[PDB]
Each structure stands twice: as C-alpha cells, then as structure tokens.
Amino acid sequence: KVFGRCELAAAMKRHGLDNYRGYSLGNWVCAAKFESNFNTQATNRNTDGSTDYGILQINSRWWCNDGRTPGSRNLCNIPCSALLSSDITASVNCAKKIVSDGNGMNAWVAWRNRCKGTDVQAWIRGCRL
Ligand SMILES: [Cl-]
Ligand SMILES: [Cl-]
Ligand SMILES: [Cl-]
Ligand SMILES: [Cl-]
Ligand SMILES: [Cl-]
Ligand SMILES: [Cl-]
Ligand SMILES: [Cl-]
Ligand SMILES: [Cl-]
Ligand code: NA
C-alpha cells in the first residue's frame, strides 16, 4: 500500500506514535516519506547484506528475521515480511522499540539527514487529526 500523507499520519496517531519518546507526529511522517515514500512494500538491500523493510525501513541486522542476514538478531521478534503489511501495526511496534534503544530517531539515517531540525510539522499540515 502507498499511503497518503494525512492517511499515514492518522494511522501513526491511532497506533500511538505521536509524541512517542518525545517525537512529534511530523517527525514520524517525515521519516516515512524519506525512508519508503509512504510505500509499505518498500525493501532496500544494504551493503552489509542486511535489508531494510517497510514504511519505516526497519533493518534485518537487529530488528527482524529474514533468514538471510548472518549474525543478525530479531529484537522485535517478527519476520521482516510482517513489516510489509498494509497494516502498519508491526512496523509501529518495532519502531517504538528502536526509538527507545538510546539514539532516538537518529537510528533512521534519512531522519537525521533529511528531517531532523526541519519544519516537520509541515508533514501533518492540513490533516484532519
Ligand atoms: Cl507527500
Ligand atoms: Cl509535528
Ligand atoms: Cl538471518
Ligand atoms: Cl536472497
Ligand atoms: Cl533476537
Ligand atoms: Cl521469522
Ligand atoms: Cl495501519
Ligand atoms: Cl531522544
Ligand atoms: Na535479523
């Protein structure tokens, strides 16, 4: 599924991401925009042989199991394929663990490079929330 901006914002809010660990909803929407372009099916192979999965590009080295990332953990206890669902519950549940891991949203390199410090509230502008 390719979410609409305000559509994803509403789903993230429903699922308890707005202000989770202090990060406003615009931060999460901005991260999803630059990680996956709002596409739940997005996958991206990393140079280390791990893969990033779903609307928040959660990575198989630590967070999910794909059976093909040697030495990796599965700290969210989910198959990475669960992160590709039209329903964002698994991705949100796992994002909450990630953002609680110590470095906040700096875990998402596209957040740090493209969202952090910007006017992130623009991403939820005009949304009925
Ligand atoms: Cl957009
Ligand atoms: Cl915001
Ligand atoms: Cl593996
Ligand atoms: Cl493969
Ligand atoms: Cl594990
Ligand atoms: Cl699995
Ligand atoms: Cl959803
Ligand atoms: Cl933080
Ligand atoms: Na893994």
d(CA 32, ligand 2 centre) in Å? 13
d(CA 55, ligand 1 centre) in Å? 13
Beta strands in 1-129 (DSSP E): 43-45, 51-53, 58-59
What are the distances in angstroms from CA 5 to CA 12, 31, 93, 107, 120? 11, 12, 20, 22, 13
At 104, is the secondary structure helix, strand, or coil?
helix
Structure tokens at 62: 């630590």
Technique behind the model: X-ray
Please identify every residue whose CB atom is under 5 Å from ligand 4, which is an ion: 68
- Resolution of the coordinates in A? 1.6
The C-alpha atoms of residue 125 and residue 112 are separated, in whole angstroms, by 21
The C-alpha atoms of residue 19 and residue 105 are separated, in whole angstroms, by 12
What residue type is 115 in one-letter code?
Answer: C
Alpha carbon dihedral 82, 56, 99, 11, in 10-degree steps, equals -80
CB-CB contact of 40 with 3 (8 Å): yes
Domain positions in the chain are 1-129
Domain 1-129, CATH among 3.90.1150.10, 3.30.70.20, 1.10.530.10, 1.10.1040.10: 1.10.530.10
At 84, is the secondary structure helix, strand, or coil?
helix
Nearest to 24 by CA among 126, 116, 108: 116
